[PDB]
């Protein structure tokens, strides 16, 4: 669910997850997909494509189990869809941390999200 | 379409539409519906419920016809879905104008939209 996702993002990036990514670029946070603006935004595009494949569960609402083994996020066995959901979230949390060097505060509150150019199909 | 909605909001409110309303509150702009924060947000709640009842046309992309008779927006009935769509947009532009006295800049970039309390059924 968004709660586990937020926790992973807070721990990997050190940033306030909703403030920093909740409306960022054409793909992060609320809304849908669009042509990515930068490397952070591409992380978020890959994540929304990941959610789009999960028909067996609800990515926004469904809880799942995961733990930390030293510095590694480990997704618990769950059921098939919930395990894949956890892997989507783990992957984007790591991606956002690795791309902090090009995070652009100008893109943080993108009130033009509905006018983004059309994204490539997932 | 959102192009015409934008033009209606700019002329009725005098404000930059996407900047001032594109992420405002729990109901305005990108995303879905949520428990409304204030009178401006309730305008947007009514509008999203208005879009939901339309069938047979696309409220974000489909262009409709309208004109100005002095100060009055007049929807030309293209077909019945498109007339209703125009009437949804006219109503919200007038509503936002009448509530400028209560517009709160603090709600303008609501990065917590996904966490809004679930809206009542339309
Ligand atoms: C905007 C936000 O904080 O939510 C999301 C995060 C990841 C994927 C989807 C969403 C959403 O709100 O739709
Ligand atoms: C989000 C924004 O600026 O667009 C909208 C306006 C009214 C209704 C819906 C939308 C949308 O993007 O979904």
Going by their DSSP bridges, the two strands A72-75 and A66-69 should be labelled as antiparallel
| Residue B12 structure tokens | 């009725």
CB-ligand 2 contact for B22 (6 Å cutoff)? yes
Residue B22 to residue A90: CA distance in whole angstroms = 30
Residue B58 contacts A, CB cutoff 8 Å: no
Closest-CA distance, B69 to chain A, in angstroms, reads 29
Q: Give the CATH number of domain A1-122; options: 3.40.50.300, 3.30.710.10, 3.90.400.10, 1.20.90.10.
A: 1.20.90.10
> Of A52, A55, A60, A58, which Cα lies nearest the Cα of A121?
A52
| Residue A60 structure tokens | 């926004």
Q: What is the resolution of this structure in A?
A: 1.7
**How far is residue A23 from each of residues A30, B51, B69, B85, measured CA to CA in Å?**
6, 23, 38, 27
- HEC sequence for chain A: CHHHHHHHHHHHHCCCHHHHHCCCCCCCCCCCCCCCCCHHHHHHHHHHHHHHCCCCCCCCCCCCCEEEECCEEEECCCCHHHHHHHHHHHHHHHHHHHCHHHCCHHHCCCCCHHHCCCCCCC
CB–CB contact A23 B114 (8 Å)? no
Residue B22 contacts A, CB cutoff 8 Å: yes
B96, containing H or E segment: helix B80-98
| Residue B33 structure tokens | 């519906």
Which residues, listed in sequence order, are joined to residue B76 by a DSSP beta bridge? B65
Return the residue matching tokens 């892997």: A87
Q: Report CA(A31)–ligand 2 centroid distance (Å).
A: 9
A23, A26, A30, A40: residue to mutate for ligand 1 pocket, most atoms within 8 A of CB: A30
> What is the experimental method?
X-ray
Contact B112, A22 (CB under 8 A): yes
The number of the ligand nearest the C-alpha atom of A85 reads: 1
Alpha-carbon torsion angle A56, A62, A68, A69, nearest 10: -20
Contact B9, B96 (CB under 8 A): yes
Contact A31, A113 (CB under 8 A): yes
Which residues lie closer than 8 Å to B80 by C-beta, 6 or more apart?
B56
Q: Where are the domains positioned within chain B? A: 1-122
Which residues, listed in sequence order, are joined to residue B109 by a DSSP beta bridge? B23
Which of A18, A29, A111 lies closest to B22 in CB terms?
A: A111
Q: Report CA(B60)–ligand 2 centroid distance (Å).
A: 7
The count of other CB atoms within 10 Å of the CB of residue B75 is 18
How many alpha carbons lie under 13 Å from residue A99 in its C-beta half-sphere? 18
Residue B2 to residue A18: CA distance in whole angstroms = 26
Contact A75, A86 (CB under 8 A): yes
What is the Cα B17 distance to its own chain's centre?
Answer: 10
């Amino acid at each position: 669910s968004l709660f586990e996702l937020g926790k992973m993002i807070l721990q990997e990036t050190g940033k306030n997850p909703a403030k920093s990514y909740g409306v960022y670029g054409c793909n992060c946070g609320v809304g849908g997909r669009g042509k990515p603006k930068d490397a952070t935004d591409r992380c978020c595009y890959v994540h929304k494509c990941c959610y789009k494949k999960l028909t067996g569960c609800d990515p926004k609402k469904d809880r799942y189990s995961y733990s930390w083994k030293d510095k590694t996020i480990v997704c618990g066995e769950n059921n098939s869809c919930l395990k894949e959901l956890c892997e989507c979230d783990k992957a984007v949390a790591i991606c956002l941390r690795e791309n902090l060097d090009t995070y652009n505060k100008k893109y943080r509150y993108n009130y033009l999200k509905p006018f983004c150019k059309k994204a490539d199909p997932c």
